[PDB]
Amino acid sequence: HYLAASRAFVVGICDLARLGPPEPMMAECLEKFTVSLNHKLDSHAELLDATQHTL
Amino acid sequence: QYRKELGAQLHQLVLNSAREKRDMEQRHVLLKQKELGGEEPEPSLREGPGGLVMEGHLFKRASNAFKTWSRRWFTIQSNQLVYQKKYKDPVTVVVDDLRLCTVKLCPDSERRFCFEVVSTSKSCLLQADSERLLQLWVSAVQSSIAS
Amino acid sequence: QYRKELGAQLHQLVLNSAREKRDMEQRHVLLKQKELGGEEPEPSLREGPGGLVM
Amino acid sequence: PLGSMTVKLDFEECLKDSPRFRASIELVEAEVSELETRLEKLLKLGTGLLESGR
Amino acid sequence: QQQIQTLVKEGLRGFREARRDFWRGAESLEAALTHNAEVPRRRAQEAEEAGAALRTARAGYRGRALDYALQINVIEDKRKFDIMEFVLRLVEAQATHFQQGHEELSRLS
Amino acid sequence: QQQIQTLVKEGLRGFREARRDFWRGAESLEAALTHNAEVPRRRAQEAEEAGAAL
Structure with missing residues (x-):
């Protein structure tokens, strides 16, 4: 529920980004910040998969 | 490291902007007072x-x-x-x-x-x-x- | 005669004013840009x- | 320049009042309302994330 | 609160008030044209008076148009930075959280 | 029509729009003071941010 809550919040920051102009700082930095956010959600998913295994 | 480096470019960029849009406002009151036209296109x-x-x-x-x-x-x-x-x-x-x-x-x-x-x-x-x-x-x- | 004499003072008086309140506006954008204070009274x-x- | 509202607003016809200019004033606004709903959707999701987090 | 709420709360006020008066001036311009066109050519003084108000409408509508131009020109630069700032502050708190938890990692190990 | 109607129609618009924003700014100032006063002295960065908005 937390990872899905986050995952929907990171899509809302993404939506700004395609609305805006597609300039180098927006185009590359703003995208590298938000993809690192999604990467971290998936890794954290692997920890809830491994907690479940454990339990 | 990326955050602090970009974030540092961000404070100056918006100071830059703060000057920019004021310059624009300063030309505009000069335009309105001195150069503004009442005549038809x-x-x-x-x-x-x-x-x-x-x-x-x-x-x-x-x-x-x-x-x-x-x-x-x-x-x-x-x-x-x-x-x-x-x-x-x-x-x-x-x-x-x-x-x-x-x-x-x-x-x-x-x-x-x-x-x-x-x-x-x-x-x-x-x-x-x-x-x-x-x-x-x-x-x-x-x-x-x-x- | 009174109408045309006063009425003539009236057009210049309000031209005078038109300059006056613009001068005031011109000091004001100068005040806002250059001299406007963010500090507490x-x-x-x-x-x-x-x-x-x- | 490359800005999203820049490239669909006509500075050039802005004193000149063409149907083009009336069209740009209208056209640019649609992004303004868009941007305001997306800002609002981000605030709602922000409390959802705060609620589930806690 | 610092960013997004301040942004929707403060940041479209001065542009929408410039939009209000600009379209009021449009309104003023259209009746200005209306009163300039419907006068008969024999009533010269009255028509000159009506055209003097049109010189008013047209000028001050150019004046209103510039303000709209200023204010849209501010929000194109402003929108990108504020939300970049918001994302800056997001990954900042993350970096700060993993580092506190990484810092005692040796004691835990 | 030229005088009195033009006068009530046009002539209080720009003052009442200046009145609207001035009392909005008053409003803004009061919450600005409100957020400046209620911060604790230990939370220095947050308080400095709130005083910058003031």
Whole structure:
């Protein structure tokens, strides 16, 4: 529920980004910040998969 | 590391902007005080792909039963006069040809700044915003009648 | 006669005004850009009828 | 320049009042309302994330 | 609160008030044109008075148009930065959280 | 029509729009003071941010 809550919040920051102009700082930095956010959600998913295994 | 490096470019960038849009505001009060114009926008009679072009606002009379006056944007191009019915949508023809038109300077009319263009298939009364604009729309049709 | 004489003073008076309140506006954008203060109003500790007032 | 509202607003016809200019004033606004709903959707999701987090 | 709420709360106020007066001036311009066109040519003084108000309408509408231009021109630069700032502050708190938890990692190990 | 109607129609618009924003700014100032006063002294960065908005 937390990872899905986050995952929907990171899509809302993404939506700004395609609305805006597609300039180098927006185009590359703003995208590298938000993809690192999604990467971290998936890794954290692997920890809830491994907690479940454990339990 | 990325955050603190970008974030540092971000504070100066927006200081840069803060100066920028104030500079713009400072030119603007200078524009309003010193250079701001009360005169009507003036159309231009200048050569294009096929001869002289002019485009601009005019008043005309509607096709309703009261014949009520209304403002539309008119173009003279390729020995034709058309009127635009919406922005980005096909135009409608007002006079089929200009080489077959005559141009009425209407000195005994009640209506002010008006002219009439009368062609074989079609006529149109029209009315402009200034004595300059009358003479400039009457001369553009009059060069057009000589094409 | 009174109408045309006063009425003549009236057109210049309001031209005078038109300049006046624009001058005021021109100082004001200069005030806002250059001299406008973000700091709090500061009280003053100064002698009156019976000693110091604030 | 390359800005999203820049490239669909006509500075050039802004004193001149063409149907183009009236079209740009209208056209640019649609992004303004868009941007305001997306800002609002981000605030709602922000409390959802705060609620589930806690 | 610092960013997005401040942004929707403060940041479209001065542009929408410039939009309000600009379309009021449009309104003023259209009746200005209306009163300029419907006068008869015999009533010269009255028509000159009506055209003087049109010189008013047209000028001050150019004046209103510039303000709209200023204010749209501010929000194009402003929109990008504020939301970049918001994302800056997001991954900042993350970096700060993993580092506190990484810092005692040796004691845990 | 030229005078009195023009006068009530045009002539209080720009003052009432200046009145609207001035009292909005008053509103803004009062919450600005409100957020400046209620911060604790230990939370220095947050308080400095709130005083910058003031």
